[PDB]
PDB file of all heavy atoms in Angstrom:
ATOM      1  N   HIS C  73    -160.940 103.547 -66.132  1.00 75.17           N
ATOM      2  CA  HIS C  73    -161.278 102.325 -66.864  1.00 75.17           C
ATOM      3  C   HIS C  73    -160.203 101.267 -66.630  1.00 75.17           C
ATOM      4  O   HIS C  73    -159.016 101.498 -66.916  1.00 75.17           O
ATOM      5  CB  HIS C  73    -161.496 102.633 -68.348  1.00 75.17           C
ATOM      6  CG  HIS C  73    -160.304 103.262 -69.016  1.00 75.17           C
ATOM      7  ND1 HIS C  73    -160.030 104.615 -68.926  1.00 75.17           N
ATOM      8  CD2 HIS C  73    -159.342 102.733 -69.806  1.00 75.17           C
ATOM      9  CE1 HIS C  73    -158.943 104.887 -69.624  1.00 75.17           C
ATOM     10  NE2 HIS C  73    -158.508 103.762 -70.166  1.00 75.17           N
ATOM     11  N   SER C  74    -160.607 100.133 -66.084  1.00 76.19           N
ATOM     12  CA  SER C  74    -159.701  99.065 -65.694  1.00 76.19           C
ATOM     13  C   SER C  74    -160.521  97.778 -65.548  1.00 76.19           C
ATOM     14  O   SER C  74    -161.736  97.834 -65.339  1.00 76.19           O
ATOM     15  CB  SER C  74    -158.964  99.384 -64.388  1.00 76.19           C
ATOM     16  OG  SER C  74    -158.073 100.477 -64.533  1.00 76.19           O
ATOM     17  N   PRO C  75    -159.883  96.628 -65.663  1.00 75.12           N
ATOM     18  CA  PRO C  75    -160.554  95.372 -65.285  1.00 75.12           C
ATOM     19  C   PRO C  75    -160.804  95.303 -63.782  1.00 75.12           C
ATOM     20  O   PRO C  75    -160.242  96.063 -62.982  1.00 75.12           O
ATOM     21  CB  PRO C  75    -159.570  94.294 -65.733  1.00 75.12           C
ATOM     22  CG  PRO C  75    -158.787  94.930 -66.833  1.00 75.12           C
ATOM     23  CD  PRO C  75    -158.648  96.371 -66.446  1.00 75.12           C
ATOM     24  N   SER C  76    -161.652  94.357 -63.406  1.00 73.40           N
ATOM     25  CA  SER C  76    -162.161  94.264 -62.032  1.00 73.40           C
ATOM     26  C   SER C  76    -161.075  93.900 -61.038  1.00 73.40           C
ATOM     27  O   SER C  76    -161.169  94.266 -59.861  1.00 73.40           O
ATOM     28  CB  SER C  76    -163.301  93.250 -61.970  1.00 73.40           C
ATOM     29  OG  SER C  76    -162.836  91.931 -62.238  1.00 73.40           O
ATOM     30  N   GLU C  77    -160.013  93.215 -61.486  1.00 71.19           N
ATOM     31  CA  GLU C  77    -158.892  92.926 -60.604  1.00 71.19           C
ATOM     32  C   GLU C  77    -158.142  94.205 -60.218  1.00 71.19           C
ATOM     33  O   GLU C  77    -157.806  94.417 -59.052  1.00 71.19           O
ATOM     34  CB  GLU C  77    -157.939  91.933 -61.269  1.00 71.19           C
ATOM     35  CG  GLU C  77    -158.554  90.546 -61.479  1.00 71.19           C
ATOM     36  CD  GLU C  77    -158.793  89.814 -60.177  1.00 71.19           C
ATOM     37  OE1 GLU C  77    -158.023  89.999 -59.211  1.00 71.19           O
ATOM     38  OE2 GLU C  77    -159.782  89.045 -60.115  1.00 71.19           O
ATOM     39  N   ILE C  78    -157.908  95.085 -61.198  1.00 73.74           N
ATOM     40  CA  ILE C  78    -157.283  96.366 -60.942  1.00 73.74           C
ATOM     41  C   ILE C  78    -158.200  97.259 -60.122  1.00 73.74           C
ATOM     42  O   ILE C  78    -157.742  98.008 -59.248  1.00 73.74           O
ATOM     43  CB  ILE C  78    -156.848  97.022 -62.282  1.00 73.74           C
ATOM     44  CG1 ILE C  78    -155.856  96.113 -63.000  1.00 73.74           C
ATOM     45  CG2 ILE C  78    -156.203  98.387 -62.054  1.00 73.74           C
ATOM     46  CD1 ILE C  78    -155.537  96.559 -64.402  1.00 73.74           C
ATOM     47  N   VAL C  79    -159.527  97.157 -60.337  1.00 75.38           N
ATOM     48  CA  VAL C  79    -160.494  97.901 -59.549  1.00 75.38           C
ATOM     49  C   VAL C  79    -160.473  97.472 -58.084  1.00 75.38           C
ATOM     50  O   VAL C  79    -160.424  98.306 -57.172  1.00 75.38           O
ATOM     51  CB  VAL C  79    -161.900  97.755 -60.158  1.00 75.38           C
ATOM     52  CG1 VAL C  79    -162.959  98.362 -59.239  1.00 75.38           C
ATOM     53  CG2 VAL C  79    -161.965  98.447 -61.507  1.00 75.38           C
ATOM     54  N   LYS C  80    -160.422  96.167 -57.832  1.00 76.09           N
ATOM     55  CA  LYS C  80    -160.336  95.655 -56.456  1.00 76.09           C
ATOM     56  C   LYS C  80    -158.967  95.954 -55.840  1.00 76.09           C
ATOM     57  O   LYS C  80    -158.857  96.063 -54.613  1.00 76.09           O
ATOM     58  CB  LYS C  80    -160.619  94.163 -56.426  1.00 76.09           C
ATOM     59  CG  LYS C  80    -162.057  93.798 -56.719  1.00 76.09           C
ATOM     60  CD  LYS C  80    -162.264  92.283 -56.677  1.00 76.09           C
ATOM     61  CE  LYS C  80    -163.693  91.918 -57.002  1.00 76.09           C
ATOM     62  NZ  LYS C  80    -163.908  90.435 -56.974  1.00 76.09           N
ATOM     63  N   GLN C  81    -157.937  96.093 -56.671  1.00 74.67           N
ATOM     64  CA  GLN C  81    -156.632  96.523 -56.171  1.00 74.67           C
ATOM     65  C   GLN C  81    -156.689  97.965 -55.699  1.00 74.67           C
ATOM     66  O   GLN C  81    -156.121  98.303 -54.644  1.00 74.67           O
ATOM     67  CB  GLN C  81    -155.573  96.334 -57.247  1.00 74.67           C
ATOM     68  CG  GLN C  81    -154.158  96.707 -56.827  1.00 74.67           C
ATOM     69  CD  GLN C  81    -153.135  96.464 -57.903  1.00 74.67           C
ATOM     70  OE1 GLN C  81    -153.480  96.035 -59.003  1.00 74.67           O
ATOM     71  NE2 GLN C  81    -151.886  96.746 -57.612  1.00 74.67           N
ATOM     72  N   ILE C  82    -157.338  98.845 -56.473  1.00 72.28           N
ATOM     73  CA  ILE C  82    -157.423 100.254 -56.095  1.00 72.28           C
ATOM     74  C   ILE C  82    -158.405 100.430 -54.930  1.00 72.28           C
ATOM     75  O   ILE C  82    -158.266 101.370 -54.121  1.00 72.28           O
ATOM     76  CB  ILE C  82    -157.812 101.074 -57.342  1.00 72.28           C
ATOM     77  CG1 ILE C  82    -156.724 100.968 -58.401  1.00 72.28           C
ATOM     78  CG2 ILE C  82    -157.990 102.567 -57.055  1.00 72.28           C
ATOM     79  CD1 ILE C  82    -157.113 101.514 -59.747  1.00 72.28           C
ATOM     80  N   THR C  83    -159.364  99.504 -54.761  1.00 74.17           N
ATOM     81  CA  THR C  83    -160.471  99.676 -53.831  1.00 74.17           C
ATOM     82  C   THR C  83    -160.020  99.703 -52.366  1.00 74.17           C
ATOM     83  O   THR C  83    -160.527 100.500 -51.578  1.00 74.17           O
ATOM     84  CB  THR C  83    -161.483  98.541 -54.045  1.00 74.17           C
ATOM     85  OG1 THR C  83    -161.910  98.533 -55.408  1.00 74.17           O
ATOM     86  CG2 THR C  83    -162.720  98.708 -53.162  1.00 74.17           C
ATOM     87  N   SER C  84    -159.015  98.905 -52.013  1.00 74.67           N
ATOM     88  CA  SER C  84    -158.580  98.814 -50.623  1.00 74.67           C
ATOM     89  C   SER C  84    -157.807 100.062 -50.179  1.00 74.67           C
ATOM     90  O   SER C  84    -156.591 100.133 -50.351  1.00 74.67           O
ATOM     91  CB  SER C  84    -157.724  97.564 -50.402  1.00 74.67           C
ATOM     92  OG  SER C  84    -158.470  96.382 -50.635  1.00 74.67           O
ATOM     93  N   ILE C  85    -158.521 101.044 -49.617  1.00 74.10           N
ATOM     94  CA  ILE C  85    -157.924 102.294 -49.132  1.00 74.10           C
ATOM     95  C   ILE C  85    -158.563 102.634 -47.807  1.00 74.10           C
ATOM     96  O   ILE C  85    -159.800 102.670 -47.692  1.00 74.10           O
ATOM     97  CB  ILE C  85    -158.124 103.459 -50.142  1.00 74.10           C
ATOM     98  CG1 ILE C  85    -157.357 103.226 -51.447  1.00 74.10           C
ATOM     99  CG2 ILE C  85    -157.693 104.796 -49.546  1.00 74.10           C
ATOM    100  CD1 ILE C  85    -157.699 104.215 -52.530  1.00 74.10           C
TER     101      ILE C  85
END
Side-chain angles (χ1 to χ4, degrees):
Chain C
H73 58 279
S74 293
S76 66
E77 295 292 327
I78 300 171
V79 171
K80 291 180 181 179
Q81 182 178 1
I82 298 169
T83 304
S84 296
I85 294 170

